[PDB]
Design an enzyme around this catalytic site. Structure first.
Site, short mmCIF file in Angstrom:
data_model
loop_
_atom_site.label_atom_id
_atom_site.label_comp_id
_atom_site.label_asym_id
_atom_site.label_seq_id
_atom_site.Cartn_x
_atom_site.Cartn_y
_atom_site.Cartn_z
N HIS A 29 11.22 -0.40 3.29
CA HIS A 29 12.09 -1.54 3.68
C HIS A 29 13.16 -1.19 4.73
O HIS A 29 14.03 -1.98 5.03
CB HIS A 29 12.58 -2.25 2.39
CG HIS A 29 11.45 -2.87 1.58
ND1 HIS A 29 11.64 -3.39 0.33
CD2 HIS A 29 10.11 -3.00 1.84
CE1 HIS A 29 10.48 -3.85 -0.16
NE2 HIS A 29 9.51 -3.60 0.72
N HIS A 68 -0.05 -0.76 0.47
CA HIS A 68 -0.94 -1.51 -0.38
C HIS A 68 -2.25 -0.73 -0.63
O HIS A 68 -2.74 -0.76 -1.75
CB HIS A 68 -1.13 -2.97 0.17
CG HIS A 68 0.09 -3.80 -0.07
ND1 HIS A 68 0.05 -5.13 -0.42
CD2 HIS A 68 1.40 -3.43 -0.13
CE1 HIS A 68 1.30 -5.57 -0.59
NE2 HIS A 68 2.13 -4.54 -0.44
C1 HEM Z 1 9.26 -2.52 -5.76
C2 HEM Z 1 8.33 -2.23 -4.85
C3 HEM Z 1 8.11 -3.15 -3.73
C4 HEM Z 1 8.12 -4.50 -3.68
C5 HEM Z 1 8.32 -5.48 -4.85
C6 HEM Z 1 7.90 -4.80 -2.33
C7 HEM Z 1 7.78 -6.09 -1.87
C8 HEM Z 1 7.50 -6.52 -0.55
C9 HEM Z 1 7.31 -7.88 -0.14
C10 HEM Z 1 7.30 -9.13 -0.98
C11 HEM Z 1 7.12 -7.86 1.18
C12 HEM Z 1 6.91 -9.07 2.08
C13 HEM Z 1 5.50 -9.40 2.41
C14 HEM Z 1 5.48 -10.49 3.48
O1 HEM Z 1 5.90 -11.66 3.11
O2 HEM Z 1 5.03 -10.30 4.71
C15 HEM Z 1 7.17 -6.47 1.61
C16 HEM Z 1 7.18 -5.99 2.93
C17 HEM Z 1 7.14 -4.67 3.28
N1 HEM Z 1 7.16 -3.66 2.38
FE1 HEM Z 1 7.49 -3.69 0.47
N2 HEM Z 1 7.78 -3.68 -1.59
C18 HEM Z 1 7.79 -2.64 -2.40
C19 HEM Z 1 7.69 -1.26 -2.17
C20 HEM Z 1 7.32 -0.82 -0.86
C21 HEM Z 1 6.99 0.53 -0.50
C22 HEM Z 1 6.89 1.63 -1.49
C23 HEM Z 1 6.71 0.54 0.86
C24 HEM Z 1 6.39 1.64 1.82
C25 HEM Z 1 6.74 2.91 1.67
C26 HEM Z 1 6.89 -0.85 1.36
C27 HEM Z 1 6.91 -1.25 2.69
C28 HEM Z 1 7.06 -2.56 3.16
C29 HEM Z 1 6.99 -2.91 4.61
C30 HEM Z 1 6.91 -1.93 5.82
C31 HEM Z 1 7.02 -4.27 4.68
C32 HEM Z 1 7.09 -5.17 5.90
C33 HEM Z 1 5.89 -5.92 6.34
C34 HEM Z 1 5.94 -6.43 7.75
O3 HEM Z 1 6.85 -6.07 8.58
O4 HEM Z 1 5.07 -7.28 8.03
N3 HEM Z 1 7.36 -1.61 0.31
N4 HEM Z 1 7.51 -5.70 0.57
#
Ligand code: HEM
Ligand code: HEM
Ligand SMILES: NNC(=O)c1ccncc1
Ligand SMILES: [Cl-]
Ligand SMILES: [Cl-]
Ligand code: NA
Ligand code: NA
Lengths: 713, 713
Positions: free
Chosen positions: A244, A77
């Site tokens: 993810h 972010h």
């Molecule tokens: C199309 C692009 C992406 C979308 C739409 C997306 C969306 C999301 C959403 C909705 C969450 C859940 C937030 C929550 O409810 O706690 C999340 C979690 C996460 N995203 Fe993404 N993401 C995107 C790209 C990325 C990228 C580029 C990274 C890192 C390189 C990333 C890493 C993560 C991680 C590590 C979590 C987990 C959070 C946790 O364990 O609390 N995402 N993502």
């Protein structure tokens, strides 16, 4: 409290140029962050962060006992607000901790992540910035979970107030497209400079475009937004699948349980937000996005399980406990661990946007290769995570500390090392003399050097005169740069350079990048001399010449000035008034209002306008460096009117005789209209101001010449 | 472009503390206006202004061939925005040339007045500010027309951007009372800190209260607004009758002929506004207020004709050509000259507000005395014109040039000359040692010196520790100053002072004013030492002790701190949140956000709170100078909640145990809430910041001690 904004909503706002003053900065005026960071024991910080990953705090319990996924999301972010169109956003100023980003819906519960980090920030103090800390923490999360990163560079200094960024015109968080302030038109064309699909999102909506769970259509939004954040298909697949691989989303209960975002919370919340009434409000009951997805069987360890699952199951549409659309592998066993209850297991789940990686035909080819070759996936992800988190850091000379990668990447607009003695003051004087003897005019010298230096932008620290990229595609053919005149100037400068270098001993030579700047300095010197003043314009050698092969032509496109008020140039007709574009460009060049005013007024009389336009050239001694712009602008004996032919061009006529004296643009005349700018113009238009104008001009000229010179920092 | 303001209208705005940065100022950081002005040839400027008076320009022809009345009105508008409640507004910063005042309806066509002065401004450049120039031009208009002024002081430095002043909440120009943002409640009670009856007016409506032409009711508005601009009945009658001895009003045609105010006009208008479609739009056809009144038979010469007419006729209500209410003399001959046509004459006319001078019983007695004794009229008007145009300039030490009147006026809060040798560094060490040996505590010493120094406000440069007015009525009785504790501290200081003075040779003595400040310094020193730091606090001697007779008790009332967040003090319950009042106070003390932050955190741990309150005293070593405030405030092991008894008081409890650790107010906790303030608190709460906190504290402490020390400029 009724304000000037309320009364005059379309008056130019100059306060964007006077942000980041010494007054709001708590650090002494001599504090140097690079020197503080260079003495940080980075290894000790990383050990404390390693320990943090598994030290759960009861006020925000760690999923699976590990904060790693939360922190990766936090550092994505931080970096993920970046737009290539203006270089604004990104991680490089730690803006996540200020309004409005601290309270964007997509940043929900990142306030908890930042708070977890306070004991470490506090321990190391000014030797590590928040900005650097957010990124380092993401790296350490990765590393603690078995992922080898590509490197890390410190040097992102903290800022002390919100940047003013145009995030869009919507007045409602998350407003769906096609509203009265729609950021889309035509066939789903996103307005520049935006790089997200809705107000308050990082890139795309995880349910799908405007909430429609179509993975195919979602992929189009992904591709377009990530491209506007400088990532191609390969990097985008690697980034999303890479991230993810860890953690989970949070949507344990209905969204209406979630209270006020941090900027709206009560004072007792102490800077935290999104307080939830759902059960314990945290941990197993957490609500963040409203989705409830855990991607892999080992959410605290690096794996290739994201693609094993994505390809290994068939997906069906379902709803989270909050009612959001998501996907489940219903044919599957319960192989995914629960975040808190060791006796629960869950089926594999995915977001609509995850399925995009499989159902978009171009992404599918890359995802399949990554699936079959997870070592290629790991390498692409590391490289992309480095690029993501470093894209706005600027030239390699700003990278600090012991983990900077040695490999030079094409995205960094690299500049070769200098391996020879530099020219001295006497050599610089000889070259200036030779430049002036060649016949190149004040106008050509100033225009060429302005063209080379003014591509710089402080938002992402791209551009500037280092490298001599003005001689290379695409800069040499940009319309604003006057390609045929440019080619003739460069040809002459190149011959002067070859002759001087061929006559040296001892390895000494001058770069074309340096000579273009030095030739601009000669031009300004000659212009001062034309007006009866002897000045020396300072000059710092050490620029080098980058090759074509070291220059990504497509990434360079975003630096093309389509509006440059300093050259009275507008490439086409825009909905944004030209004076607004002038202030925008001034902000990107790091200029205050006074610096902008003095610079423009001098450029006008030096002949820097594109196409030799007469607009704003309010002098009968063009190519002499005088304050004529301001004296003639402010002369009440001249009356101004919009032309019949063009309402954006104005005629200045003698008020008594009707005689046509000058023409000007909105960019010219705003200096005689806007009450703050006119106050500035009055200083430089006063009878005691000739020396001050010349001195302040030379200083701002020099500042622009040196904008990218972090090798001298 | 959706902003932080739009999203979170109840988030504190700190940008008011970071206005007037070096960034917006075109003059060097070393430019000293006093020194520039001291070299101006003021006589030559005045000669040029005398010449201007009758040099008519065609674009705004001079009434009666003389711009004198226009310029008097210009200078009385410049000074006339002043409010005694906060000292904001007035002439002292030349704010008439910026938004919003440049476009207030009451300042219509003063844009032309200021444009007439550009040639003179331009000629003399930085050696005369616009702010000084507007007032000088008024003085010269008076002198040119046969009225000898009381004097003139330069030294009003120009500013370079709008001040942020609360002018009211109305969203419509000129809105009449009783609207949704009414500035009146109850029995016509004007809200503090306002000093005008409608948004966009200087004081009152010339037609009468809300446009009702009742001269008796108008007089009540006059009295109240003028009192809120520091004028009593005598001064008010002298000013109104004095001014309306000259010139005329302008209302030749319907107000709908008048176009956009300057900030709304097109760019081609070049900073001017109110362009009129009525006939020539100027001169004989001018429309400014909509009224058409010429008061005297010789509008370009000083006379006694205003009172002759006011008493010598009976008045009948009538309408101007624009439809405004105004008064015409019953049965009179056409004895008033026309401004442009020598063959036209007019009957005497008056505003409703002029008739107030006759039909208010208290004004009538003064107006009759002025009528019968024109020499007393002339002297009162001169005195009041001097006070009007200098009331916001501050101590006499700021007054520059050769026309400063030698007579010392009560309204200047005068300070006696020092006529004896000052204490040196050895004497200062001796006195600090005696102060600490007396038994006075850190808390008493710091609280007393804070109380004395922090009455200063930079808006009008009133207050501060010079004078030792803390020992006099009314300051000694102010609740915030803890009258009984104060009396005991002053009693001990006075004995130390008398003993020291009685032992001196050569006439050396120390003032109580200096000793109060020095004793505060000793207290800060002792506190640093209580925390193991060896600190010497700077001290500049030279304050003197003003007498009671030099201290107007009633004028002093507006400096009473009814809110002082630096002492966690709020006198009553206000509609404005306390954190907003804190920022307001910081602004008046000239502090930046960092300075406010460091200062408050230190004062809290030194025991400066009113009544010994524990609120915000987040230390177990009170009276030791440490950064405990910040370290404890930012401690996430503590959770904060509003109390049941009072929602503006908070309890901080151990998150694990539930034990009560501290209490705090909104002023305390805003530092842990607001994202910019918290960023500042984090610097000072970091493990490497103990010495930086101490040093930054001492610097801001010393700044506050010296705020009124214009004798050291
Ligand atoms: C199309 C692009 C992406 C979308 C739409 C997306 C969306 C999301 C959403 C909705 C969450 C859940 C937030 C929550 O409810 O706690 C999340 C979690 C996460 N995203 Fe993404 N993401 C995107 C790209 C990325 C990228 C580029 C990274 C890192 C390189 C990333 C890493 C993560 C991680 C590590 C979590 C987990 C959070 C946790 O364990 O609390 N995402 N993502
Ligand atoms: C109750 C207080 C006052 C009211 C309501 C008031 C109202 C006005 C109005 C409505 C105008 C006409 C503006 C125009 O149409 O051009 C005017 C003109 C003027 N006023 Fe006042 N006034 C007040 C006090 C003062 C004071 C204190 C001074 C100076 C000491 C002053 C000096 C002038 C002068 C010189 C003009 C003439 C301008 C010219 O000749 O163009 N007035 N007044
Ligand atoms: N609005 N103007 C003021 O409050 C001010 C001006 C200069 N110093 C301190 C305060
Ligand atoms: Cl930004
Ligand atoms: Cl003000
Ligand atoms: Na950026
Ligand atoms: Na003021």
């Amino acid at each position: 409290g009724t304000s000037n904004r309320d009364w005059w909503p379309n008056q130019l706002d100059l306060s964007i140029l006077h942000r980041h003053s010494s007054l709001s900065d708590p650090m002494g005026k001599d504090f140097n962050y690079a020197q503080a960071f260079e003495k940080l024991d980075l290894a000790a910080v990383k050990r404390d962060l390693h320990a943090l990953m598994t030290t759960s705090q009861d006020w925000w319990p760690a999923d699976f006992g590990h904060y790693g996924g939360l922190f990766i999301r936090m550092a994505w972010h931080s970096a993920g607000t970046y737009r290539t169109a203006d270089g604004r956003g990104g991680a490089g100023e730690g803006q996540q901790r200020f309004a409005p980003l601290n309270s964007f819906p997509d940043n929900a519960n990142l306030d908890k992540a930042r708070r977890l980090l306070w004991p470490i920030k506090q321990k190391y103090g000014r030797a590590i910035s928040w900005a650097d800390l957010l990124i380092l923490t993401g790296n350490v999360a990765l590393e603690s979970m078995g992922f080898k990163t590509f490197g890390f560079a410190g040097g992102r200094a903290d800022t002390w107030e919100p940047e003013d960024v145009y995030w869009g015109s919507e007045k409602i968080w998350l407003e769906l497209s096609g509203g009265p302030n729609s950021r889309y038109s035509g066939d789903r064309q996103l307005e520049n400079p935006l790089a997200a699909v809705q107000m308050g999102l990082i890139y795309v909506n995880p349910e799908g475009p405007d909430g429609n769970p179509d993975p195919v259509a979602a992929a189009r939004d992904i591709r377009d937004t990530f491209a506007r954040m400088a990532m191609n298909d390969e990097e985008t697949v690697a980034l999303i699948a890479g991230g993810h691989t860890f953690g989970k989303t949070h949507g344990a209960g209905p969204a209406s349980n979630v209270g006020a975002e941090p900027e709206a919370a009560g004072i007792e919340a102490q800077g935290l937000g999104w307080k939830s009434a759902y059960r314990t409000g945290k941990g197993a009951d957490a609500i963040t996005s409203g989705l409830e997805v855990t991607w892999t069987t080992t959410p605290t360890q690096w794996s290739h399980n994201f693609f094993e699952n994505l390809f290994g199951y068939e997906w069906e549409l379902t709803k989270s406990p909050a009612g959001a659309h998501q996907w489940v592998a219903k044919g599957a066993d319960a192989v995914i661990p629960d975040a808190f209850d060791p006796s629960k297991k869950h089926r594999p789940t995915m977001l609509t946007t995850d399925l995009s990686l499989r159902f978009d035909p171009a992404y599918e080819k890359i995802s399949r290769r990554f699936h079959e070759n997870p070592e290629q996936f790991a390498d692409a992800f590391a490289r992309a995570w480095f690029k993501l988190t470093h894209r706005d850091m600027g030239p390699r000379a700003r990278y600090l500390g012991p983990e900077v990668p040695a490999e030079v990447l094409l995205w960094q607009d690299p500049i070769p090392a200098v391996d020879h003695p530099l020219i001295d003051a006497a050599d610089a004087a000889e070259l200036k003399a030779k430049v002036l003897a060649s016949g190149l005019t004040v106008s050509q010298l100033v225009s060429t050097a302005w063209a080379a230096a003014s591509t710089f932008r402080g938002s992402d620290k791209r551009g500037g005169a280092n490298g001599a990229r003005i001689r290379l595609a695409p800069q040499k053919d940009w319309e604003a740069n006057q390609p045929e005149q440019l080619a003739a100037v460069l040809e002459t400068l190149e011959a002067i350079r070859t002759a001087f270098n061929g006559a040296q001993r001892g390895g000494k030579q001058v770069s074309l990048a340096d000579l273009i700047v030095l030739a601009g300095c000669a031009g300004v010197e000659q212009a001062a001399k034309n007006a009866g003043h002897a000045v020396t314009v300072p000059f710092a050698p050490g620029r080098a010449d980058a090759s074509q092969e070291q220059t990504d032509v497509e990434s360079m496109a975003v630096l093309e000035p389509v509006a440059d008020g300093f050259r009275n140039y507008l490439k086409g007709k825009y909905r944004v008034p030209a004076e607004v574009l002038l202030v925008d460009k001034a902000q990107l060049l790091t200029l205050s209002a006074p610096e902008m005013t003095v610079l423009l007024g001098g450029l006008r009389v030096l002949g820097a306008n594109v196409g030799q336009s007469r607009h704003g050239v309010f002098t009968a001694r063009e190519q002499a460096l005088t304050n004529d712009f301001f004296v003639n602008l402010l002369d009440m004996g001249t009356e101004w009117k919009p032309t019949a032919a063009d309402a954006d061009v104005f005629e200045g006529r003698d008020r008594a005789t009707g005689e046509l004296k000058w023409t000007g643009t909105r960019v010219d005349l705003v200096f005689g209209s806007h009450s703050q700018l006119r106050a500035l113009a009055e200083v430089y238009g006063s009878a005691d101001a000739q020396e001050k104008f010349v001195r302040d001009f030379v200083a701002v000229w020099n500042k622009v010449m040196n904008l990218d010179r972090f090798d001298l920092a």
